[PDB]
């Protein structure tokens, strides 16, 4: 008994041993993952409160709106893909146009590659030489 | 034959993606629409073609040598 | 489609399209020239005009006291009516008249037609502008109301525009339906969850606290803190799961792209995922054309690969959502093929159960778009205690959750160069659905012998086990099996509702009625219909089931059981009652029309003895959309029972889908098993002393995968011999083929095996020094361990 | 990767991970290493430290082979081989190397530190692989030692070319020279980012010190300046491998009758065209580098290459080749550095002309 | 006992020996996939031997490579780089470009 | 889960009868039970006999029984003592030291201050 009860000890306090290791381990994680919950959570808020969302909302008959609208409305910057030439066409013509009821100016485009793209080279003739889900975001223009 | 065109041009379309030809948006486009048609084809001559079409890709680039690679 | 001689009468009469319009072929399609949409939609005025005029005709009758009942086959095209010859009089001002079977028959046509445009326009004027809604309005409840009033007044029963007020599912249903009309005239943005910005220790936030839903109306969180100092974990986690902070957060977002709904971006920039083609093997090829293989007019090829895929192409997938439309469905025939439906599965249980019981399989894998970034649904599942998880199941049936829904390009082989899409889903959902189904689901898995064939292995000799139990005590018997177009990208919510209302019956002490609906809400507001995170932005998804959830199986063999039922019924009760067989069914017939749309609650009795009917002239064996048909062939000559022409109604006035009949396979013979199911053809041979039936797969499939894989998986065979181990089980049954190209190909397989098995021995006892006591590995080179696979003994 | 016995020539899958270069020692080789010298560290596969948490046991002979993993003496489990026993470590392939016997010598090598000439001298009697490894365990030393210099940092700036600097207290201050190039770092609470490379030189007095700009900045009192490192990369070729010559018309079409004066040391000239590879002593200010160009012009059409460690020698040695030699020349010597002048006659790289000269690096 | 032992301790000493010998294959060879699958490609076209395939491979050899993708209908331009002019005798004559 | 206050080994236990929760190793921490009345420990688990109504907290009376702290009234037939060798088993039971200064630690978690020595 002294040459096999010793080792039933000692199997058992290793196991257990072993397994509050991986305990303590998860407890870590849990507070990492927690730390990180918080901290994106208060950086991500501090770059939309604009007060039109605050004058929207005094405006709502008890504050709950739907969520569509939010951007629709508050949102600053504009992005729009456009398929080929003919879309472009008649929906971006001119370094600024309306949309959602407001005026928007035009600022920067891109390609699929990210190449800045000047806006004269977008012409009838020379669309079949650029990649084509074209970015073009632009600013609130007021 | 055909099913060794087949393998061969799945060989060809497998060593371009990693030479970085994904980048150049419409060339990638062109290439994995011309390997897709080709899987699907009938005859020698279409597939003959589509392929030279297709490695006359690898050819004008300049990244793997020919001559020292083609020892025999 | 062969005789439809009265409905292009009909469309050129009154200048719906110009006769030349029947010469491009499949003018009948929806996917296939989608413009017939726009021909139909030169019909709703007409049918308009005949509810008003309907509505005046039933005011006069009850004014002047008359009593009687009114059917579609009086009422001309223009409203007028006709043959008065079987009403009576009574004290005026007092008389009723009857019209559910007027307005239950027509709802369908109602939407196929899209009869209430005219409501949008500023005076129901189609020479008009829209109406100009108020951005920040959510309610509309009146305008339900009035619509309601307009239209069915004479309706007798009770709508509540806000289902969260019904006493039952079956209320549920009846509301829902409704609803789903009137909400294709108001403005889509007013759609979604209800955000409220909420103070945290002085800080703002933007929360959901409601959604506003298509069809169920409007429904309102119980526990909401407006101020609080600081948060929980369990709070921090629905609030990160929310799609509010993230939609706010965004920038304004247009795509021309696609047709729908856009939200929001999130970067700056879009991504553009790929899917890059396979791994060749050559030793292996070089192996197989050495034996004489792949010479020209063999029969076997290949026909399996890895296809490439550029870039634009998740977009261009996300597209096939526009085939999703809004859909009307008789609320009477439904609710009867509910209940007979939920008769059914009758021989299972299902419960809530607590965190203890819950039992998970491979911890380690995704878990959403908030969470992706940390870990796997171990780290998860691991960091939260029972009662976090306790807790957390008790507030989803308070409240509502919206989720977010990840999208990505499967990696796989396939015969068709059409893209793949898996669907990663948020934790939450995983848990508390979970929670919820894994008793009820582990029940229907277990059972053996039943409608529904999940969970039970082909091995063993299960597949004949099975093709036995199909094939009853059939008269004349056939088999018939058919196929959904489209079936995932097309589901109508309405069916889908009521399959998560089937599943939910068993429910009926754990829960209450409250808790009921709001897991209802729960799970429509994260599967069915919810935010779809594409490529780098936000979407809005119009409907049709989802594929990484956890009950999209079960769903699906619920709704395909309800399709062939409701085509039964639809079949029997076209028949002229004047040249029916012996008087039961024509007696039985006529008890079914009288408890369908006369008889207002359920009749038990008939319910049990239908069933019974059922199964004793259709058998049907059920997986998820795929299905295998022997039904008595006599009967179906009459048109007593369910036909494929049946179907193809069925299907075409209930999916808005025309599924070509050259699809569907139909056997006379039984010696021969099913031609196809679960892709796998069907063969008799003889086993030890008898017959038995034998799944064999397609060759090619076969040879491609052993051919094709990915890089180092098995680039060299040499590292894992178990792949072409379990290759070779499937394989077997191809020996005992008449052909004997079949057999050859299991015999090259045993060949590479044993010689990727020596070569290894040699290459480890060469240039390494010891490998070798017992052998152990001749089994894996005869086919006595592999026939032991079929021997109906384990 | 795998790799193969530094002695026995065999693969090999272990490297004594306590010396510096980790080359790849058989079996019984690394156990006579590790059994006579002081390190007890080998990188195979993995490393070799008790998998338990909270021990630091990463000597081998502590070491047993438990379930899937070795632990120390309190985690050993109980069934479990010993590591290195039988007087041999365990491996892969482990009983098909052979062993060797200049382990004493090899360790010797990889412990001394050259600072008398007794290891310098043992360097160039052993095998040539191990000379090779032994050169460049001695270049990487060297290497190493270099980032024994301290830091500078500025006083103030005066003007372009006035500035003062400290070093940093009980630091090795390095030479100030024209090859020595300093990188130069900004650091705020966030951009810590690099200013550029300089080299500096004394001014008139004092602290006073010049330098050059390759980065434009408008240099402020808060830059310092490090060492740029530059490491080593492995060889693979001995030195001066043989394939012996023949007399069998080997040579190539030499010239007939040119030189004049210079046509005289003839004979020498076919007998190197008949020879591998030889050499020729010379005192200093005698007869050579006019040879570099008698064989030179002796066999115009020969590519023949001359490259010097020293830029001012190769210089030299090139201007007189320009002087009496092939002037298609073309001498690509000088990579993007261009730190010290040289030739001011042609381009910086063509590798097709047949008398090119560069620098050994 | 101490034979059972002995054996128990050679099988898993055996065991962990291959598994980790497999380990050093898969990692080496994924580490040198980058020109085996240019080896590859090379024999599949060398065992091939189709004649356009090997003219122009042959072409490329000697130093004569296109710049765009090579056209299949009648219409539509290729451009070819000649760095020499043997190549123009061998298949530029006159005006028919025999690639 | 740090260095003991009273050997800086790294540890992960704090008296139950101080307020403060010091870091204590096993030998320092074993050393601080002895020296005062302080039989609480606090750990991953709390030590105490986590039996169904039972109260002992003492780390010298609690028994490792099976995968429970345990007293010997409610210890299963196989039981370990946690308070034993002058170092109470736990984390890195090896390194563990142990102090010097124990009596001034155990007079300062003791101390009312309200004497003038307390302060000084
Ligand atoms: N054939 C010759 N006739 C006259 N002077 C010579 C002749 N060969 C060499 N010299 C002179 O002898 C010197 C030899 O020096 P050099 O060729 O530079 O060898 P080293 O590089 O060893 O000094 C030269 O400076 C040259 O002026
Ligand atoms: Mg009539
Ligand atoms: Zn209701
Ligand atoms: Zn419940
Ligand atoms: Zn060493
Ligand atoms: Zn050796
Ligand atoms: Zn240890
Ligand atoms: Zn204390
Ligand atoms: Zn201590
Ligand atoms: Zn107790």
Redesign the interface.
Known sequence: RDAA?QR??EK??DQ?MTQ??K??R?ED??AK??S???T???T??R???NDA?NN??N???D?????????????????????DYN?YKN?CDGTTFT??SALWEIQQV?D???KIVQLSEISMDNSPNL?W?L?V?ALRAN | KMSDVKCTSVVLLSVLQQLRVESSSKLWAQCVQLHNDILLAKDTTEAFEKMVSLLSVLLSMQGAVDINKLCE | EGNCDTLKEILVTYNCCDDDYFNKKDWYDFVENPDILRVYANLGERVRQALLKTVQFCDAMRNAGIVGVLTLDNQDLNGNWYDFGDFIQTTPGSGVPVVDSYYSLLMPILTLTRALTAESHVDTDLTKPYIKWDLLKYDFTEERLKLFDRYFKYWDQTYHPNCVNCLDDRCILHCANFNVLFSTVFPPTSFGPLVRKIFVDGVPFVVSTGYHFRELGVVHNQDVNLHSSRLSFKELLVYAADPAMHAASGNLLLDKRTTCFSVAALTNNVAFQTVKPGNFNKDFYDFAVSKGFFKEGSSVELKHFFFAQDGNAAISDYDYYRYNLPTMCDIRQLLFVVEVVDKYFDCYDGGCINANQVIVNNLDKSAGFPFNKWGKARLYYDSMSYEDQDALFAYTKRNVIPTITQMNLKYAISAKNRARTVAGVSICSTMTNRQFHQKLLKSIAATRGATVVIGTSKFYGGWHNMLKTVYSDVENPHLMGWDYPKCDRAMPNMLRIMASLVLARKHTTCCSLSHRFYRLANECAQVLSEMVMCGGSLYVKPGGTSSGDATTAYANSVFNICQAVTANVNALLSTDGNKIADKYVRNLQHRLYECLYRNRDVDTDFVNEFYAYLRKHFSMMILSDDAVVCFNSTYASQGLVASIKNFKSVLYYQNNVFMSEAKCWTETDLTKGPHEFCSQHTMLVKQGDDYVYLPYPDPSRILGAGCFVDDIVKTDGTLMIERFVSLAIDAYPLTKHPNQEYADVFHLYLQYIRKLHDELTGHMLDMYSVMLTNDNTSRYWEPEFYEAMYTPHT | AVGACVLCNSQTSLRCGACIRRPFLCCKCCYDHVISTSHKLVLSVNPYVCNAPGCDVTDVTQLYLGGMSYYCKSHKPPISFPLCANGQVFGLYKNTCVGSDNVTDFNAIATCDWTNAGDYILANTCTERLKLFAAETLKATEETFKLSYGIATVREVLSDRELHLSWEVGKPRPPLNRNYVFTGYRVTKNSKVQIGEYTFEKGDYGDAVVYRGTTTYKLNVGDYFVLTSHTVMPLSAPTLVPQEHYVRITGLYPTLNISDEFSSNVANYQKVGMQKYSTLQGPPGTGKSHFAIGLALYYPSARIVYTACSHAAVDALCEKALKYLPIDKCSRIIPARARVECFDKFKVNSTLEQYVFCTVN
């Open positions: 009860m039933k000890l058992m306090a257990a509050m290791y305990q303590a998860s994680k849990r993952v927690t990180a919950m918080q994106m959570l208060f991500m808020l770059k939309l409160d969302l929207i909302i405006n709502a008959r504050g709950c709106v739907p969520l569509n609208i939010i951007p629709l409305t508050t949102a600053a910057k504009l992005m729009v893909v456009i398929p879309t929906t949309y959602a891109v699929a590659d990210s990649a889900p970015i975001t």
